[PDB]
Design an enzyme around this catalytic site. Structure first.
Site, PDB file in Angstrom:
ATOM      1  N   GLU A 144     -10.977  -0.991  -0.278  1.00  0.00           N
ATOM      2  CA  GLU A 144     -10.230  -1.661  -1.336  1.00  0.00           C
ATOM      3  C   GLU A 144     -11.095  -1.923  -2.560  1.00  0.00           C
ATOM      4  O   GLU A 144     -10.588  -1.913  -3.688  1.00  0.00           O
ATOM      5  CB  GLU A 144      -9.656  -2.980  -0.825  1.00  0.00           C
ATOM      6  CG  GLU A 144      -9.023  -2.896   0.550  1.00  0.00           C
ATOM      7  CD  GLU A 144      -7.518  -2.764   0.491  1.00  0.00           C
ATOM      8  OE1 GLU A 144      -6.968  -2.744  -0.630  1.00  0.00           O
ATOM      9  OE2 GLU A 144      -6.886  -2.691   1.566  1.00  0.00           O
ATOM     10  N   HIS A 179       2.031   1.797  -3.432  1.00  0.00           N
ATOM     11  CA  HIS A 179       1.003   2.430  -4.250  1.00  0.00           C
ATOM     12  C   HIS A 179       1.013   3.940  -4.060  1.00  0.00           C
ATOM     13  O   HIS A 179       0.970   4.701  -5.035  1.00  0.00           O
ATOM     14  CB  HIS A 179      -0.371   1.852  -3.915  1.00  0.00           C
ATOM     15  CG  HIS A 179      -0.466   0.373  -4.110  1.00  0.00           C
ATOM     16  ND1 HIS A 179      -1.472  -0.389  -3.557  1.00  0.00           N
ATOM     17  CD2 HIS A 179       0.314  -0.485  -4.808  1.00  0.00           C
ATOM     18  CE1 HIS A 179      -1.304  -1.654  -3.900  1.00  0.00           C
ATOM     19  NE2 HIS A 179      -0.229  -1.738  -4.662  1.00  0.00           N
ATOM     20  N   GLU A 228       0.827  -1.202   0.000  1.00  0.00           N
ATOM     21  CA  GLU A 228       0.000   0.000   0.000  1.00  0.00           C
ATOM     22  C   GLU A 228       0.863   1.256   0.000  1.00  0.00           C
ATOM     23  O   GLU A 228       0.535   2.246  -0.665  1.00  0.00           O
ATOM     24  CB  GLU A 228      -0.942  -0.010   1.203  1.00  0.00           C
ATOM     25  CG  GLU A 228      -2.129  -0.954   1.057  1.00  0.00           C
ATOM     26  CD  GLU A 228      -3.261  -0.347   0.254  1.00  0.00           C
ATOM     27  OE1 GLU A 228      -3.010   0.630  -0.483  1.00  0.00           O
ATOM     28  OE2 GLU A 228      -4.404  -0.841   0.364  1.00  0.00           O
ATOM     29  N   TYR A 284       2.037   7.283  -7.158  1.00  0.00           N
ATOM     30  CA  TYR A 284       1.389   8.515  -7.588  1.00  0.00           C
ATOM     31  C   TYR A 284       2.346   9.698  -7.510  1.00  0.00           C
ATOM     32  O   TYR A 284       2.298  10.598  -8.358  1.00  0.00           O
ATOM     33  CB  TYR A 284       0.133   8.759  -6.755  1.00  0.00           C
ATOM     34  CG  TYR A 284      -0.905   7.667  -6.904  1.00  0.00           C
ATOM     35  CD1 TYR A 284      -1.510   7.416  -8.130  1.00  0.00           C
ATOM     36  CD2 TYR A 284      -1.290   6.896  -5.815  1.00  0.00           C
ATOM     37  CE1 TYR A 284      -2.460   6.422  -8.267  1.00  0.00           C
ATOM     38  CE2 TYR A 284      -2.243   5.902  -5.943  1.00  0.00           C
ATOM     39  CZ  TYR A 284      -2.822   5.670  -7.171  1.00  0.00           C
ATOM     40  OH  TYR A 284      -3.766   4.682  -7.299  1.00  0.00           O
ATOM     41  N   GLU A 331      -5.186  -4.436  -5.374  1.00  0.00           N
ATOM     42  CA  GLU A 331      -6.413  -4.138  -4.642  1.00  0.00           C
ATOM     43  C   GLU A 331      -7.389  -5.300  -4.705  1.00  0.00           C
ATOM     44  O   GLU A 331      -8.041  -5.626  -3.706  1.00  0.00           O
ATOM     45  CB  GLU A 331      -7.072  -2.877  -5.203  1.00  0.00           C
ATOM     46  CG  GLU A 331      -6.207  -1.644  -5.105  1.00  0.00           C
ATOM     47  CD  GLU A 331      -5.559  -1.522  -3.749  1.00  0.00           C
ATOM     48  OE1 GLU A 331      -6.299  -1.398  -2.751  1.00  0.00           O
ATOM     49  OE2 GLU A 331      -4.313  -1.561  -3.678  1.00  0.00           O
ATOM     50  N   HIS A 361      -6.485  -7.808  -2.185  1.00  0.00           N
ATOM     51  CA  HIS A 361      -6.689  -7.286  -0.839  1.00  0.00           C
ATOM     52  C   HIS A 361      -8.159  -7.342  -0.441  1.00  0.00           C
ATOM     53  O   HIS A 361      -8.508  -7.876   0.620  1.00  0.00           O
ATOM     54  CB  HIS A 361      -6.163  -5.855  -0.755  1.00  0.00           C
ATOM     55  CG  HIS A 361      -4.695  -5.740  -1.005  1.00  0.00           C
ATOM     56  ND1 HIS A 361      -4.063  -4.529  -1.187  1.00  0.00           N
ATOM     57  CD2 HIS A 361      -3.731  -6.685  -1.101  1.00  0.00           C
ATOM     58  CE1 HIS A 361      -2.774  -4.733  -1.387  1.00  0.00           C
ATOM     59  NE2 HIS A 361      -2.546  -6.033  -1.339  1.00  0.00           N
TER      60      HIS A 361
HETATM   61  O1  LIG Z   1       0.755  -6.689  -2.750  1.00  0.00           O
HETATM   62  O2  LIG Z   1       0.276  -6.644  -1.380  1.00  0.00           O
HETATM   63 MN   LIG Z   2      -3.443   0.396  -2.694  1.00  0.00          MN
HETATM   64 MN   LIG Z   3      -4.996  -2.395  -0.854  1.00  0.00          MN
END
Ligand SMILES: [O-][O-]
Ligand SMILES: [Mn+2]
Ligand SMILES: [Mn+2]
Ligand SMILES: Cc1cc2nc3c(=O)[nH]c(=O)nc-3n(C[C@H](O)[C@H](O)[C@H](O)COP(=O)(O)O)c2cc1C
Ligand SMILES: [Mn+2]
Ligand SMILES: [Mn+2]
Ligand SMILES: [O-]
Lengths: 283, 129, 283
Positions: free
Chosen positions: C154, C97, C94, C101, C188, C191
């Protein structure tokens, strides 16, 4: 209150340096081919196998604690949002370390051996004691003391068991497994450095009274953990006659752990002169 | 003379202070120049693999022809827990240059490291005459 | 008390399955070459560029929350020790992620543009409200409700912003940045499935009275988050005239979030017929 992290505005450039190194050093136990150590593993006696199994299970205990409880408990105490992101990586890689030992176990050992080794970790009073010590501070409410206990785990408690993989490597046995452990040790060093670095940053924010109270706490916690680790070491290495050399390695790394927290080394050279064959196995 | 570099953690900077020898620091931002001969003390900051390991501020200071000409030796700091990368920054500076590899130490260095570098650096400077 | 994790004895094989998929899909923002989208980025209007920035900054807040607070808060509620290890990987990925950005922002936008996107995220009442909602349950003391808020994040909250990168990709614009988003969406999906799967397992341990209370909470929380997302979507997508389709995408993902939690889909098929070009972009 939370607020999306801006990696283009870093409050501490050291956070990005550690993030790049840790993520760039990403690895999984599948990267190390432990299958080639099957012959070497078979050349160990029943006692030599049992010692390695218990030492490895003890390392898994510290990895399980540091990933599940240790690294996560440091997130609320972070100074920058990027420190929080770095801490999530430590928690994950710690889980990778704990799983790597099960991959070694699955490749070399039998189910009966693994169950005996894991049952031993549950009953060993010294292993349980060292976990209860750091866990009490991980779950406490003193943030600076928590970082001292965390650094002592990464830079001191781990190395009582890290000795054996280096000892086997010095004897041309279980060489691939030692390469697996070396990947863990490389990661642990960065964790102990980073968590210790952040501890020093928090020391600059408190008063002189708190600074002295924390120096006393560090020496008290180090020796309390050391006294427990020497008993832990005796029960394991006394059969193979390696206790005295592991104790040198323990004091050698305890001085390193102190320097990570900004303190000076405590033990002299004549008490940390570990066997050079072990040090050559590290570097 | 002594020219050393240290990052924000200052593990190498604090060792140079305990040395007691007057030394000049390579700044974290910007370039500098030295006039007298000097010995370099820098930490290692490499990862997986002689491409890197040397701080970028040291690369800029050593890319300076006038500064590189007066380099006489290198002492590297690091950590034995880094495997073959142990103080490999000194190996890079020693190999890619003509200077020798004087000493290695870990983090802030022990009390024996300070006494070893003081006596070693004194006997090395008397060798330059 | 803690007890070293034994990966050779799993109480739930799903933990190893999810671990292998999550770790096997490891990636970093440097792997996707976003620089090639600079030409395409220049063809966006001042509003279209600002819209992409606000959507991305809003996604960064959800990623920051789920990594720093969300995933770590699920560790004490885990049913198996291997579930704890999987959650550490989610918490780390996460954070990756959220950094992706910032990597995209650095390549395409300017410092003044990036600052405007983050300043908007601090003041936007809809983005802050959705963050305050999940944080209230993450930091609470209701474990099953906490897992519901995670699954809705998620499987539902994220996709209000995932629509735009797929929209640009369907129009042959910002294609490389869209490949980065596909890597995020790939994570995602696992998850939301995993956290929702564990929510269902915990549901079997409580009584029918509590089970009905959680179904009521899920529908109530979905309605609160959905009503807040339409206002969030309107204020953003009304300028480009994409609001009607994003709402279809919202219901399409709200059904996914509900089904991840074991509940039946709420919106009918004629209400989730999102634009086929967008669904094809997710392939
Ligand atoms: O890829 O948690
Ligand atoms: Mn994420
Ligand atoms: Mn996630
Ligand atoms: C990201 C990173 C990478 C490192 N790599 C090495 C290495 O490859 N070899 C080594 O001996 N030490 C390595 N170290 C340890 C540092 O060299 C050591 O902590 C040094 O004392 C830092 O100096 P400074 O605090 O004065 O900047 C590394 C440290 C960090 C943070
Ligand atoms: Mn570890
Ligand atoms: Mn670690
Ligand atoms: O370990």
């Amino acid at each position: 209150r939370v607020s999306a992290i801006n990696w283009n505005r870093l409050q501490d450039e050291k956070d990005a340096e550690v993030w790049d190194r840790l993520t760039g050093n990403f690895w999984l136990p599948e990267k190390v081919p432990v299958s080639n150590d099957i012959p070497s593993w078979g050349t160990l006696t029943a006692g030599e196998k049992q010692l390695t199994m218990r030492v490895f299970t003890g390392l898994t205990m510290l990895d399980t604690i540091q990933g599940t409880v240790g690294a996560v408990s440091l997130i609320p105490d972070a100074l920058t949002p990027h420190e929080e992101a770095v801490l999530t990586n430590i928690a994950f890689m710690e889980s990778v370390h704990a799983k790597s030992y099960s991959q070694i176990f699955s490749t070399l050992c039998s189910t009966a051996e693994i169950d005996d080794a894991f049952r031993w970790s549950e009953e060993n009073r010294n292993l349980q004691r060292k976990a209860e010590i750091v866990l009490q501070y991980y779950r406490g409410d003193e943030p600076l003391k928590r970082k001292v206990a965390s650094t002592l785990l990464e830079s001191f408690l781990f190395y009582s068991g890290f000795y054996l993989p280096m000892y086997w490597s010095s004897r041309a046995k279980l060489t691939n497994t030692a390469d697996m452990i070396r990947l863990i040790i490389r990661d642990e060093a960065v964790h102990g450095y980073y968590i210790g670095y952040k501890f020093q940053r928090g020391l600059a924010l408190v008063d002189d009274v708190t600074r002295a109270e924390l120096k006393d706490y560090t020496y008290e916690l180090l020796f309390e953990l050391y006294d427990n680790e020497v008993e832990y070491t005796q029960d394991l290495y006394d059969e193979v006659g390696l206790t005295e050399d592991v104790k040198k390695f323990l004091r050698y790394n305890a001085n390193k752990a102190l320097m990570n927290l900004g303190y000076e080394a405590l033990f002299p050279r004549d008490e940390t002169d570990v066997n050079p064959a072990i040090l050559s196995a590290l570097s | 003379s002594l020219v050393y570099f240290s990052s924000v953690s200052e593990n190498t900077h604090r060792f140079v202070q305990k040395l007691g020898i007057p030394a000049t620091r390579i700044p974290l931002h910007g370039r500098i120049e030295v006039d007298e001969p000097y010995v370099l003390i820098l930490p290692t900051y490499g990862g997986g693999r002689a491409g890197g390991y040397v701080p970028k501020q040291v690369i800029a200071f050593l890319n300076n022809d006038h500064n590189r000409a007066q380099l006489r030796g290198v002492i590297a700091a690091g950590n034995t827990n880094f495997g073959a990368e142990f103080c490999y920054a000194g190996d890079v500076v020693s190999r890619k240059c003509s200077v020798p590899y004087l000493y290695r130490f870990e983090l802030m260095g022990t009390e024996d490291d300070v006494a070893a570098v003081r006596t070693g650096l004194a006997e090395f400077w008397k060798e330059q005459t």
